[PDB]
Symmetry: C2
């Protein structure tokens, strides 16, 4: 209620960025390996999930996460059901760190068709949304993928994204729509042209604001009209394959767009480095992403 | 003589890739910070250069560098004048690690004009080349930058690259030409189209082979005709802003092109991590880049 309204204010006004911690089981080995934990070091799914939970706990409890430069955090569903320092993760994010909690609500992608990969339908979405409200989660995130400058395909991406969004809104949660255009798209600017056009037409019909998570565009500042649309709460940006230094550099050139990075935020961090170095490097990466986010 | 010929064979035939360690003074703070050494930790240029020399020593002496997956290494001039385990760096690379040593021979870039940044002229190049021969260095590397699909500009890039190359050859050194097309180029495929066309026309007039270091192309396999040209020894590829995972993924799709990575090879590594983790992560990153390089 008063959280909600204070969280809404943060998400709309506050300078800073969102950390994406929302890797599904299928994406956790890759994140663990990059943290220096090789697949060879665990051999059950439970052990794997503990291991990534220790990582995220180590991030969230670190002094670097107490800065206010990170305004939101996106969670995997298992993490929301877990604890940090004996306290439900979302609650710890907000009560002890002043970070607005979100949850990834998608169940993965369909096979590519029409140059795009739509989200797998998820019948029990509304059940996840009510569960999230029970954890005081403020918003959601959902990812869909554009591989080509296909008008039908991109039309569909956006329409599925907004359907899911109107449904999520109903539950009193703010959805982040994530229609990622692959950075290796043969015609990226063209695809982003279609995407923008579909996006605005949907926003014109909306009666409540949403957020958007997009690849940093080929044309600097291309998303201005989106950022400025009164039904757009905030625009955040995926790295999508760029290094932290590259994403930041391009991000600096997109006025009003803030970061939403996963593995890029965290490059350099490892299991068996001292706590001192972990916090220092984490603090620096955050400062870098912040300075880029605020331009 | 018999090194030379064994090194030539490695560079032409051997599967694997080249590690680029050739950061100038101007680029060393960025590499140090990414290794967890903040600018704030040293305050002279000598201390900075020691610090990056310890890093490179720690890489080169590590068991991960004894794999044969790395076939060449590119050195900054100061490193060539330094030692590893009391032995000149280039000599240690070859005698103790079976890695072919190269040296970066450029002095930086000119201001952008015609959508490109040519290399600053370097009158004493030939003096550096003779010095390098004295250290038993096998080859050189030189970097020039293409920001736009400008025909005059790209014509010039290539012509300067080959002039420098014919000069370097004279000294009995194999040059790696590096005409980098920025990954954020508004018209990358088009620029790579011009680049390829200029490159082939120069190669048709060559009487001795060279090597090429390029951005991974927008069109998969675009450089085939180059790789196949009898005056092309080997094609290597810069990351140029892609994460290690992204560069590897795209690299896998370019048949016969091997990696030549600097900061991407080394993402995850830090000063204050245990020797054990440093070697493990280094070994894994190398294995990854290798598997991508050999496709």
């Amino acid at each position: 209620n008063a959280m909600n309204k204070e969280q809404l204010q943060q998400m709309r006004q506050a300078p800073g960025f969102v950390g994406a911690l929302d890797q599904s089981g299928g994406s956790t080995p890759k994140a663990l390996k990059a943290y220096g934990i090789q697949p060879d070091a665990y051999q059950s799914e439970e052990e794997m999930f503990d291991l990534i939970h220790q990582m995220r706990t180590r991030m969230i409890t670190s002094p670097a996460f107490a800065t206010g430069k990170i305004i939101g955090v996106i969670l995997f569903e298992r993490t929301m059901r877990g604890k940090i320092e004996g306290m439900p993760t979302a609650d710890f994010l907000w009560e002890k760190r002043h970070i607005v909690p979100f949850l990834k609500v998608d169940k993965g992608l369909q096979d590519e068709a029409n140059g795009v990969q739509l989200m797998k339908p998820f019948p029990e979405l509304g059940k996840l949304c009510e569960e999230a409200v029970g954890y005081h989660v403020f918003g959601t995130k959902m990812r869909s993928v554009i591989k080509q400058a296909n008008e039908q395909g991109i039309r569909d991406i956006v329409e599925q994204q907004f359907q899911w969004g109107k449904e999520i809104l109903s539950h009193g949660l703010v959805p982040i729509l994530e229609p990622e255009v692959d950075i290796h798209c043969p015609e990226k600017a063209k695809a982003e042209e279609i995407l923008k056009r579909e996006l605005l037409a949907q926003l014109d019909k909306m009666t409540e604001p949403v957020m958007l998570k997009i690849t940093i565009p080929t044309v600097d500042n291309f998303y201005k009209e989106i950022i400025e649309h009164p039904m757009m709460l905030r625009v955040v940006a995926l790295s999508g394959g760029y290094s932290r230094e590259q994403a930041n550099e391009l991000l600096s050139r997109n006025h009003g767009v803030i970061a939403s990075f996963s593995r890029a935020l965290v490059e350099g961090l490892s299991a068996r480095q001292t706590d001192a170095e972990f916090n220092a490097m984490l603090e620096a990466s955050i400062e870098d992403v912040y300075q880029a986010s605020i331009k």
